[PDB]
Design a protein around this nucleic acid. Structure first.
Length: 563
RNA sequence: GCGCUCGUAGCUCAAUUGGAUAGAGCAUCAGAAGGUUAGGGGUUCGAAUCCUCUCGAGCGCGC
């Protein structure tokens, strides 16, 4: 149920009937304060200028043809001409009911698109670092959200499985095999190819045979790759990320394309051998002219083939990119090249969602106390430990068999539900005291809140198959608030899918919880004057439980049934 | 030197993308307090949001 889009039309299909142009835009948002009802129409003022009249007069000129009967119970004008809509109880207590009768809670299925999500993107022959945790989590949240809506999501893991370093890598592997897993690999082999070593010409030659390709050096490649991706699939499985091995499309598939991509870029008149390198000129920035590359004898030419392959072979209607902030240039530049070359059209967006670096409670890069890179596994280990200590001092002397299970949900959930709360792209603070707490917008609070709600719909007799025969009658203004927000689940979902931002979902869920936690300490679902309301508020509570569950599911957050 | 992303309560984060009196959680003496949205100017009915400067933070291409 997308009430916004509903009122969006009935106001648009109005307005016109009060003198308005075709390209018309009502601005139907959710009211800030509760003074302004459940929804606002802001589109007046802006329109009330292109015709040069008066906003507070164009206002009720629309209400004359605006018939929100059976929908709203109170429509009034306020301020410089806002149209405030106070939803009618009987309208809410009809879609609150419709959501219950559906396994998708009334959420409608959009036009079945085909989207490609680019997330995680770890490196080869290196233990996965914590600087990739953000990309992996948010990307998976996007995928889950899109998948629930019904689209066809192609998970894309752009693994750095190619580069110069493989000469330094494979040679070490070839040598490290003469003694007998990856922990001091990339680190030790680096100590050779600089100071000090003699047969690095062995390594610098070992790479030039990989581009040519013969199974021997091809095995030493895949062998080195498959081990890294096996270590990482473990990390994913621990992290509850939906990624898989057959979701890997790294810097290998987008490599034999490099010739006939700049050649075709030259065979279309767009490249000049400036400075000594193939370059392609664009025009939308500074006081002279900037310039990307392609060759010289790069991290911009690969993405072009990438963004092309998504469209031409994978039939991507849309393609999301969850990548570090320090890559916005290299993408936008290399994407503007695809916009003025016609590889991928216009109906196919190339979205880029960004984020900064991991920092601690001190503005410095997130590192260990030794002063170095933090392994993601080592982070998850402490997450589970700190969670155990958390659950212990509140629920001690309890079956260990169901503590690790609960500590898993709390700890691993907190690690995820911490990027799913921030939307910035200018670095971020990692603080255990913020994420692992029963207070605030934290996963444990949501997880506890969900158990709380669920308990109410448990201690009562009223079985499952006759409860939904007694209807919902909303008579009080806290039930109306709750029921409204409950129905705004589709809106939030559509915003997440559109903007690629899961923080909205979490903000909603946090906001959704607070309503219940206020609807509870005032409106006794427990026991009231009659059965008519007892069952009604149960269903009203029953919905949020299903809603909180489904919401947390789209984020990839475990939900324990009991705390 | 050019260029990217930014600057919001003491801290960690919001603000439905230009809407009404900028909101939550810790912290500080259930409600309370906490703000010239780094700062000036400008654009219009209306700005944390957009345009131009200054300062400042982080990172990419530069000789």
């Amino acid at each position: 149920m997308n009430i916004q889009a509903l009122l969006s039309e009935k106001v648009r299909q109005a307005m016109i009937a009060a003198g308005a142009p075709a390209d018309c835009e009502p601005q139907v948002r959710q009211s800030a304060k509760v003074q302004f009802g459940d929804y606002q129409a802001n589109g007046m003022m802006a329109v009330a200028k292109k015709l040069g009249m008066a906003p507070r007069q164009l206002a009720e000129q629309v209400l004359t043809h605006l018939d929100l009967n059976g929908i709203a119970s109170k429509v009034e004008i306020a301020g410089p001409g806002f149209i405030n809509i106070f939803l009618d109880p009987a309208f809410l207590a009809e879609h609150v009911q419709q959501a219950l009768a559906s396994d998708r809670l009334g959420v409608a299925t959009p036009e079945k698109q085909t989207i490609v999500v680019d997330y995680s993107a770890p490196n080869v022959a290196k233990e996965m670092h914590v600087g990739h945790l953000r990309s992996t989590i948010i990307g998976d949240a996007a995928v889950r959200t899109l998948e629930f809506l019904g689209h066809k999501v192609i998970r894309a893991n752009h693994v750095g499985d190619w580069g110069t370093q493989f000469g330094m890598l494979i040679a070490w592997l070839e040598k490290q095999q003469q003694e007998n897993d990856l922990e001091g690999f990339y680190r030790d082999a680096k100590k050779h190819y600089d100071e000090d070593e003699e047969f690095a010409e062995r390594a610098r030659n070992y790479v030039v045979k990989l581009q040519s390709g013969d199974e021997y050096f091809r095995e030493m490649w895949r062998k080195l790759v498959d081990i890294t991706m096996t270590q990482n699939q473990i990390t994913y499985d621990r992290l509850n990320v939906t990624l898989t091995r057959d979701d890997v499309m790294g810097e290998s598939l987008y490599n034999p394309m490099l010739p006939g991509i700049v050649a075709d870029l030259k065979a279309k008149g767009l490249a000049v051998e400036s400075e000594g390198a193939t370059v392609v000129f664009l025009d939308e920035f500074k006081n002279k002219e900037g310039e990307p590359m392609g060759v010289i004898i790069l991290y911009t030419t690969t993405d072009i083939a990438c963004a092309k392959y998504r469209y031409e072979t994978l039939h991507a209607d849309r393609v999301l990119y969850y990548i570090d902030s320090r890559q916005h240039q290299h993408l936008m530049q290399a994407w503007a090249i695809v916009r003025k070359a016609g590889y991928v059209p216009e109906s196919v967006p190339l979205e880029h969602h960004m984020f900064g670096m991991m920092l601690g409670k001190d503005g410095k890069p997130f590192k260990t106390r030794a002063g170095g890179t933090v392994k993601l596994a080592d982070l998850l280990d402490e997450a589970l430990e700190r969670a155990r200590r958390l659950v212990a001092e509140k629920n001690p002397d309890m079956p260990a068999d169901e503590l690790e299970k609960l500590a898993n949900a709390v700890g691993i959930g907190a690690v995820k539900y911490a990027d799913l709360s921030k939307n910035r792209t200018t670095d971020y603070i990692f603080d255990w005291d913020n994420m692992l707490a029963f207070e605030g917008n934290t996963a444990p609070y949501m997880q506890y809140a969900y158990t709380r709600v669920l308990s109410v719909f448990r201690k009562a007799e009223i079985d499952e198959e006759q409860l939904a025969a007694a209807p919902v009658i909303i008579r009080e203004d806290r039930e109306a608030q709750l029921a409204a927000r409950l129905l705004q689940f589709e809106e939030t979902l559509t915003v997440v899918a559109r903007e690629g931002t899961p923080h909205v979902m979490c903000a909603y869920l946090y906001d959704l919880a607070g309503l219940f936690s206020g609807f509870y300490e005032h409106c006794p679902i427990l026991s009231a004057e009659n059965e008519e309301v007892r069952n009604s508020r149960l269903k009203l509570a029953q919905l949020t439980a299903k809603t909180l569950k489904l919401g947390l599911d789209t984020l990839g957050i475990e939900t324990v049934e009991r705390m």
